[PDB]
Motif scaffolding. Sequence first.
Motif, PDB file in Angstrom:
ATOM      1  N   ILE A  45     -27.763 -24.976  35.602  1.00 17.21           N
ATOM      2  CA  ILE A  45     -26.486 -25.177  36.292  1.00 17.21           C
ATOM      3  C   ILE A  45     -26.683 -26.512  36.574  1.00 17.21           C
ATOM      4  N   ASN A  46     -26.176 -27.453  35.519  1.00 19.83           N
ATOM      5  CA  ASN A  46     -26.146 -28.860  35.717  1.00 19.83           C
ATOM      6  C   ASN A  46     -25.700 -29.137  36.939  1.00 19.83           C
ATOM      7  N   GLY A  47     -26.298 -30.276  37.659  1.00 16.38           N
ATOM      8  CA  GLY A  47     -25.647 -30.834  38.979  1.00 16.38           C
ATOM      9  C   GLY A  47     -25.899 -29.994  40.345  1.00 16.38           C
ATOM     10  N   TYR A  48     -25.004 -29.244  40.526  1.00 18.28           N
ATOM     11  CA  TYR A  48     -25.392 -28.249  41.567  1.00 18.28           C
ATOM     12  C   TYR A  48     -26.708 -27.335  41.450  1.00 18.28           C
ATOM     13  N   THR A  49     -27.380 -27.260  42.480  1.00 10.98           N
ATOM     14  CA  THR A  49     -28.707 -26.705  42.602  1.00 10.98           C
ATOM     15  C   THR A  49     -29.095 -26.118  44.013  1.00 10.98           C
ATOM     16  N   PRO A 150     -18.107 -26.114  47.581  1.00 15.68           N
ATOM     17  CA  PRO A 150     -18.675 -27.597  48.223  1.00 15.68           C
ATOM     18  C   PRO A 150     -19.305 -27.563  49.798  1.00 15.68           C
ATOM     19  N   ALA A 151     -18.969 -26.616  50.264  1.00 17.16           N
ATOM     20  CA  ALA A 151     -19.388 -26.235  51.704  1.00 17.16           C
ATOM     21  C   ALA A 151     -20.491 -25.139  51.611  1.00 17.16           C
ATOM     22  N   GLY A 152     -19.942 -23.794  52.141  1.00 20.11           N
ATOM     23  CA  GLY A 152     -20.762 -22.813  52.108  1.00 20.11           C
ATOM     24  C   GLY A 152     -20.001 -21.472  52.024  1.00 20.11           C
ATOM     25  N   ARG A 153     -19.423 -21.245  50.621  1.00 22.92           N
ATOM     26  CA  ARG A 153     -18.617 -19.814  50.646  1.00 22.92           C
ATOM     27  C   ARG A 153     -19.131 -19.630  49.330  1.00 22.92           C
ATOM     28  N   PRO A 154     -18.621 -18.228  48.895  1.00 23.64           N
ATOM     29  CA  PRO A 154     -18.952 -17.431  47.702  1.00 23.64           C
ATOM     30  C   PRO A 154     -18.113 -18.063  46.347  1.00 23.64           C
ATOM     31  N   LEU A 155     -18.730 -19.328  45.843  1.00 23.73           N
ATOM     32  CA  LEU A 155     -17.888 -19.966  44.769  1.00 23.73           C
ATOM     33  C   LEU A 155     -18.636 -19.337  43.400  1.00 23.73           C
ATOM     34  N   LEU A 156     -17.873 -18.402  42.835  1.00 19.74           N
ATOM     35  CA  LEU A 156     -18.342 -17.901  41.687  1.00 19.74           C
ATOM     36  C   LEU A 156     -18.156 -18.439  40.377  1.00 19.74           C
ATOM     37  N   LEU A 157     -19.040 -18.823  39.507  1.00 19.38           N
ATOM     38  CA  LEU A 157     -19.078 -19.710  38.404  1.00 19.38           C
ATOM     39  C   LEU A 157     -18.672 -18.721  37.012  1.00 19.38           C
ATOM     40  N   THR A 158     -17.674 -19.289  36.205  1.00 17.93           N
ATOM     41  CA  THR A 158     -17.494 -18.817  34.872  1.00 17.93           C
ATOM     42  C   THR A 158     -18.413 -18.065  33.930  1.00 17.93           C
ATOM     43  N   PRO A 159     -18.280 -16.964  33.789  1.00 21.19           N
ATOM     44  CA  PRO A 159     -19.370 -16.165  32.497  1.00 21.19           C
ATOM     45  C   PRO A 159     -19.185 -17.113  31.260  1.00 21.19           C
ATOM     46  N   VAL A 160     -20.271 -16.792  30.577  1.00 27.11           N
ATOM     47  CA  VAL A 160     -20.467 -17.293  29.223  1.00 27.11           C
ATOM     48  C   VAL A 160     -21.444 -16.454  28.312  1.00 27.11           C
ATOM     49  N   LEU A 161     -20.756 -16.012  27.134  1.00 22.51           N
ATOM     50  CA  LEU A 161     -21.577 -15.164  26.198  1.00 22.51           C
ATOM     51  C   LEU A 161     -22.766 -15.858  25.566  1.00 22.51           C
TER      52      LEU A 161
END
Lengths: 273, 312
Positions: A45-49, A150-161
């Motif tokens: 997950i580039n960036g965010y960690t 960016p704060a503290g909520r459930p930010l779901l990231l896009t799936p990838v096959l």
Amino acid sequence: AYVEIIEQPKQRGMRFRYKCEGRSAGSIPGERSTDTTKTHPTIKINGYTGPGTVRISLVTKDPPHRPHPHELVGKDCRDGYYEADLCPDRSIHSFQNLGIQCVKKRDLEQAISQRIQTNNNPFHVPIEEQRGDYDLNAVRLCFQVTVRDPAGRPLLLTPVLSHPIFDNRAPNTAELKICRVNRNSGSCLGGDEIFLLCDKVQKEDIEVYFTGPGWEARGSFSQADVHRQVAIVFRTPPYADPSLQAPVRVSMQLRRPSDRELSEPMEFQYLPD
Amino acid sequence: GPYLQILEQPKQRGFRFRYVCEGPSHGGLPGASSEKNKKSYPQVKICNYVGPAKVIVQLVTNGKNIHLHAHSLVGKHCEDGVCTVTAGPKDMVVGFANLGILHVTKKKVFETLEARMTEACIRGYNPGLLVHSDLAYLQAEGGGDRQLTDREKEIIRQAAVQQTKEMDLSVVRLMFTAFLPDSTGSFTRRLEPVVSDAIYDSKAPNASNLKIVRMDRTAGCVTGGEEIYLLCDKVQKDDIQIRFYEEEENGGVWEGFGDFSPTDVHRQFAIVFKTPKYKDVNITKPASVFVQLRRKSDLETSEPKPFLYYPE
DNA sequence: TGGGACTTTCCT
DNA sequence: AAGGAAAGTCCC
């Protein structure tokens, strides 16, 4: 918040195991995997960690990537899909505990019928498409990876096959191998009968391909010449030069029309006259 | 008074059992004399003629203690595996045409076995000569249905528990039993049963018929040690061997064996081996000898194929 | 009737 | 636990 697979799962080579089948037997091998060093699938997950949940699942090969029937039992893996928290201290989180429980046609309707009744669908594909004919020798891994915002909520990231993965058992999804041959050379005139011992192959769908710079041809032989799909008796093809004058080591390999797949290469020295 | 006679037993090998899945006809259990351009079937016969008579046959087990096998002998007059034939009058020789063996699963062994023991004990078939030595009175008694009470059920069912554990689903044996009419005109007289030889499923990897399909070369130097490829019928990796032999006038000895390893038998259908030294490496004119696939086990052998040795 | 190959299992 | 073979199944 963005993602890309660092280690693409294995291509055409692994074999789909079953329930009855050796459980805890094996796992899921990675891209550059090896007979001495493994390396499983890991997504960076580039960036965010930070903290994040992960639900890995298997989906069909083509366009509308519906959730695939086969389970994926192993550590934490549930009802078929995978699910467990991701190291909330590192980024690229790996997965060493995945097994692919291919199902029987028998329990298929049920198998996919679980996918829905258990909510499984990395691409929120319509339920009316979540049925019908499915291919059981080819599957893809998906990463419905969710994290914070960016704060503290459930930010779901896009799936990838994840690149295709194929059943090795299926005699037409399997890895085309050339185990050993009697003759290793022949005359440029061609016609040297050869016995090629090979891995399970389907007579209706198999060829012996002779490559070599500027030259292309295949060994003549009929179906009846494919013994218990594990041996072929073909006749060597005429080389380009009807009057060669020295060893021109070309290459010979098993080819599968349908799949358009080519077995590893094997050398066949074309001698003169 | 008389007895039965296995006249012409079954071929004993080459027959492939079938599961219910295969359904339709798939042949007829061959005779030990069938040879294509003439085919037979296990024939039985009595001696001291008894006019009319009924001969029932069931599949038993190839163990020291003859018992009932789960497989079902499905055929014509058969039903539940007890083909019943009415030995015509005067002619005390009634054969059994296309019989066919039905293969039970390893899961349906005790399940299917219950019925077999249940039955017979009812239909009056063989006196606990297969089930147990506590019955023997499963003949006729006189009249009724022979429900043997809900008690006796415990021996049968439990007998179906220790036999189903050792049962071998790969081989069977016929059990010809003859019944001669009685006062009532019925057939109550049990004539000592006569079990057949022993029939081996061909589907089994070591009971199938050996055959040499192809050889890339059928000639080598008397020195031997010349590689050869032999394409064959499913053969058991560590139980097969290539035999070279010759009809020597001074008796008939000399035999040679290809030199290969289990690691040289490609997926039970091919064998890559080296040729053995021939007896007279001093030969000036080549000699025709034979090759033959042979099972180290039973020592069964393929039809021999010619091989020509030429001098060095 | 007679027989390959496919599918699911079991044994390493 | 990656691979070979036996058991069980379809469809010529």
